[PDB]
Amino acid sequence: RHRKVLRDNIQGITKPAIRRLARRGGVKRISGLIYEETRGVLKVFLENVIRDAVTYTEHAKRKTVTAMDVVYALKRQGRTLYGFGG
Amino acid sequence: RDNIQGITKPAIRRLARRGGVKRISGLIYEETRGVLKVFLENVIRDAVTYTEHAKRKTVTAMDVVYALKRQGRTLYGFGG
Amino acid sequence: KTRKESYAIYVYKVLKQVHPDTGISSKAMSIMNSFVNDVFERIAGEASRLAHYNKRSTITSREIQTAVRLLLPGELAKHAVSEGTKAVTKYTSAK
Amino acid sequence: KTRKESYAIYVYKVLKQVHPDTGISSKAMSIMNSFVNDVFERIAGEASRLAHYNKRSTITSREIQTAVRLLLPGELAKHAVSEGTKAVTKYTSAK
Amino acid sequence: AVSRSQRAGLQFPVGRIHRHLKSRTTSHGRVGATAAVYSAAILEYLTAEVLELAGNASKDLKVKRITPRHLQLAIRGDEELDSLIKATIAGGGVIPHIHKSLI
Amino acid sequence: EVLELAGNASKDLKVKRITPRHLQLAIRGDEELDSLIKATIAGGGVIPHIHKSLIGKKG
Amino acid sequence: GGVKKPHRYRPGTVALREIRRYQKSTELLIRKLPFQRLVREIAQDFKTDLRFQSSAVMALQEASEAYLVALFEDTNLCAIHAKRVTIMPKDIQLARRIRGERA
Amino acid sequence: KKPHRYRPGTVALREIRRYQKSTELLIRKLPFQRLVREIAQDFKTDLRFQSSAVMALQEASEAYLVALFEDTNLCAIHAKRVTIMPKDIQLARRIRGERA
DNA sequence: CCCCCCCCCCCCCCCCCCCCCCCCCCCCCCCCCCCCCCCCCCCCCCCCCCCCCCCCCCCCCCCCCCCCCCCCCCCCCCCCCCCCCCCCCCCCCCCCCCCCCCCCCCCCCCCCCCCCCCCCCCCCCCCCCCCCCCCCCCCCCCCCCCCCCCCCCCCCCCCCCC
DNA sequence: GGGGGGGGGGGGGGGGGGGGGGGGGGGGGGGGGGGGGGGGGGGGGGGGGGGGGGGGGGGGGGGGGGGGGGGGGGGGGGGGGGGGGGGGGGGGGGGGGGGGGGGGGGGGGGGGGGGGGGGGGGGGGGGGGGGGGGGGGGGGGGGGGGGGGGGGGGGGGGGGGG
């Protein structure tokens, strides 16, 4: 029976988290503009994946997005994932 | 004269131009040839595997088309 | 000599409604036929995967529809779906 | 019903043969389970088309072999083909 | 009564694999006697190859259980397995590497 | 949708028959079809284009 | 000086220390709750009233970090090709144009 | 005698225009046919080829190399050059996932 | 000419000054929770065994089309001269990394209720199958028509050089 | 700026490969109606999992400041393609024997279908027990503060004598 409005959660991918991801990817020095670029690139990637996952969910007339939905959506886009299904 | 050298600088130069390339280093010619050899090996290997399975001795356009598709390099205009 | 089915005459009919005075070369028709075969394959394939994910055996127009939403980019999908609902309707209502 | 098939008991058997004193975490078994399903879907898929292209309706051990030569990298293919062959020959030697 | 797996000298389930092929059939599709046998052998062999290498890695790390990290070192580490397995392995991280010009 | 764009591509060239080149022009020229059709169109060539930095003489 | 110059690593030394560290571990590098809200927010803007199995969200996080990390390796190759050690937006864009993506 | 010379880069731009305008094949045919047959000979002997098969292989190869030259050029330009070099082809194949 | 012995001159190659407080790192150690691990049935599930089709192979027949050749036609390779371009170095400012400090929001642990989803069970609208009727599309053969595309002529514009 | 030499464009034209329009066929789709069977939707039903709410605390995050570093810019140089002119042996188009690519038509192992049956995974549920990771506790390093010649080891002149 209540609420809470989600806004600007992309800023939750913080500068330290982006730096950690770059370190694992072997990056040594990061310019100041990389952070807003990474956020934009992550938003698009998730939009494309969430869009397909939610399409499988609705098709099945469910209201719950399942790990399988995500796994089939990742597969359709050529990004197979192992560890939940594939 | 080795066959791979039948793919000549002039032909390689024309492909680059269609690719919008303006100036070409001299080492590019051997590199392009290696790249084409690998591409052709990957595709012919799959085409010939379809031929043998069909028990023929003639590689057909379809065998090449199914080989290209398998590799994510779908081609239109030759059947299939 | 065994018959090779093709979509050529149907592609030509659609061509005529679209540009009544335009033609199409042989090599171009071959390309269109490859294009039509390719799209039907991607669509039936997704639709049967949909059916299987949902433990079902029938490929209904509803699977074809979700498959189109998964395969086509926004606008193309908007109109395509629209063209699909419209053919089914006109066909459902008949004798 | 509710019972879901898994390849985990079979993966454990194979692990015991190659590393008798080695275990596998559940996360790791989950990955192996996905890996096996993935490879099987890929082989059956190639075998089907392969059959299709040849106007055949039966998927035999011959289609599976060609499917395997198309899917695995050079050396993995040779060893897999020889293990496939060995198991067919033995199987038919009992009937 | 000997199982088809036992009859083929395999650990992977032939009967089940045969069942799964019959249902991915395609209408009037038929599945030959030996197709499932050959399939179970390819599957068991690939599985054996991946575990052999993961198990070596869990061992060079003085540890008993294979983890996703071990599966990932084993797969990225082998040219052919790396080529065959493009999937993302959850929890496997990456192979350590730093470009010489950064050092 | 494709015949319509390929058909325009040929009329704007004052020709009567749609060719592979016309199909390549229509497809790579539309964001949505380009995205949907990744196949190589035999005989289509590429869209003309020269990078600004190669075009020059500069001043 | 008195207690003399307080020790200071040179720029780059801690960064290399960091690559060695994160490259050998496997944990998720983005905080969990904030990543869950980002997921709920994007989902909501497509269809309201959706629920999520917690593992569905974990699957999207693993996929996302695996996608970003591989994109930073490619971006790092574009920077070095340009004789820099600093990745820039143009490096990320070059990597995505060649990968055949866009946005 | 007749002293007329175009500046380095002028004919080159003319070629880019001419070749992006056209659609014909650019590798001479027999040489390509020979290369194909030789590569095939290592996978199976006494092989024959439909004519349409060799043609499909040539259309696929040229579309592939042309597209590889476009990415290669982007890498040279990224490095502030206008001359493509082997390291640009390499960077481009590496990112495409082809590795070699 | 030419060559050979100087002659600086970096240059790279250890080398010899001191780190030095983190930085791992490696061994040890210990709770802990999850991973097995029996039990416990049990629906499943895979094997067998006739009984009945059946599709595929295989030899044969057919016959376009592949290779090969000859005659005719064309792209390639070339050595050379030129100039720009890539590379290298130097210079400089800006920017980003290291460190510090303070803070707080993510995490962890619990539970709990309610949604919602799966599973089963019931029911029935819907699809398949079948035979019959029919139309029918791909093919062959044909064969008149035609859009194209290379070519030509004339003119305009651009580029390079002076 | 002008000439001087080119390419390029525009409009027009012609033949010929390509396309089309025609007739004809026939095994094969296509459609019909009728019958029977089957997939599935609703409708509970019960259980399982997901937000949600609570509280406590420390690691994560943010901001700030400073300095070192790194990127950009500019210049210069030597060097490496571009352009040019020149030369020529294979490639290209057309024609023709020959060999598999289809096309066909069976028959037989092989595969399915049906029925029965005995194992075979598969959750579920305590329950014990057992690797593991984190925490601790020392221990052996690579570089930040640079460092300071000191050697071999070419290297490139340089100059002078032979």
Nearest residue to I48 via alpha carbon and C1': E1
Return the residue of B nearest to D70 by Cα.
B46
Q: Report CA torsion sign: F25, F29, F33, F34.
A: positive
Token pair recorded at residue C21: 């005075």
Nearest partner of G25 among E68, C74, H16, judged by Cα? E68
The one-letter amino acid code at B41 reads E
- What element of type H or E holds A65? strand A64-65
F57 strand I contact, CB < 7 Å? yes
Structural domains present in chain C: 1-95 (1.10.20.10)
CA distance H24 to chain F (A): 7
Structurally, chain B folds into a number of domains equal to 1
How many of the other CB atoms lie within 10 Å of CB of D29?
A: 18
CATH assignment of the domain containing B58: 1.10.20.10
DSSP E90: T
Resolution in A for the shown PDB structure? 5.0
Q: Which of A33, A58, A84 lies at the smallest CB-CB distance from G88? A: A33
Say which CATH architecture domain G7-103 belongs to: Orthogonal Bundle (1.10)
F11: enclosing H helix or E strand: helix F2-11
Distances in Å between the Cα of D76 and the Cα atoms of D62, E46, E48, H86 are: 18, 8, 12, 31
Nearest one of G21, F20, G67 to C34, comparing CA atoms: F20
Beta bridge partners of D58: E30
Technique used to solve these coordinates? cryo-EM
Q: Which domain holds residue B74?
A: 1-80
Mutate to test the interface with F, among B74, B75, B76 (most CBs of F within 10 A): B76
Tokens for E11?
């650990």
Cβ count near D4 (within 10 Å): 5
**G59 and chain A: CB distance < 8 Å anywhere?**
yes
> Separation of CA C23 and C1' I145 in angstroms?
15
| Portion 3-62 of A in contact with G at CB < 8 A | 6-7, 9-10, 12-14, 17, 19-31, 33-34, 37-38, 40-47, 49-51, 53-54, 57-58
Cα of C64 to nearest chain B Cα, Å: 22
**Eight-class DSSP state of G45:** T
> Which residues in chain D are closer than 8 Å to A86, comparing Cβ atoms?
34-35, 37-38
Q: B2: distance to nearest CA of chain C, Å?
A: 34
Q: Given CA atoms D2, D7, D8, D9 in this order, what sign does their dihedral have?
A: positive
CB C33 within 8 A of CB C6: yes
Which of the four CATH numbers 3.40.50.2300, 1.10.20.10, 3.40.50.300, 1.10.10.60 does domain H4-100 have? 1.10.20.10
**CA of A86: which chain D residue's CA is closest?**
D34
Q: Is the CB of G85 under 7 A from strand I?
A: no
Amino acid at F36: L
Measured distance CA(D47)–CA(D58) in Å, rounded: 10
CATH of the domain at E70: 1.10.20.10
C95 touches strand I (CB under 7 A): no
DSSP letters along B30-78, please? HHHHHHHHHHHHHHHHHHHHHHHHTT-SEE-HHHHHHHHHHTT--EESS
Residue from C65, D38, D76 nearest A79 by CA: D38
- Smallest CA–CA distance from C68 into chain A, residue: A55
Beta strands in chain C (DSSP E): 23-24
Query: Is the CB of C35 less than 8 angstroms away from the CB of B76?
Result: yes
Residues followed by a break in chain A, C–N over 2.5 Å?
none
CA distance B61 to H57: 8
**Beta carbons of A60 and G46 less than 8 angstroms apart:** no
Interatomic CA distance for residues H73 and F49, integer angstroms: 12
Using a CB-CB cut-off of 8 Å, the residues of chain H touching G90 are: 78
Which residues does chain H have within 8 Å of residue B19's beta carbon, measured at their own beta carbons? 65-70, 72-73
- H85 CA, I96 C1': Å apart: 32
How far from each other are the two terminal CA atoms of chain F, in whole angstroms?
44
Any idea how long chain E is?
A: 103
In chain A the first and final C-alpha atoms are separated, in Å, by 37
Where in the sequence is the domain holding E99, given as residue range(s)? 1-103
Residue G88's region, left for phi above 0, alpha for psi from -120 to 50, else beta, is beta
Nearest to B73 by CA among C21, F40, C16: F40
**Chains touching A by CB (3 or more pairs below 8 Å):** C, D, E, G
Enumerate chain F positions whose Cβ falls within 8 A of a Cβ in B: 20, 38-43, 45-46, 49-51, 54
D24: phi then psi, degrees, rounded to nearest 5? -140, 125
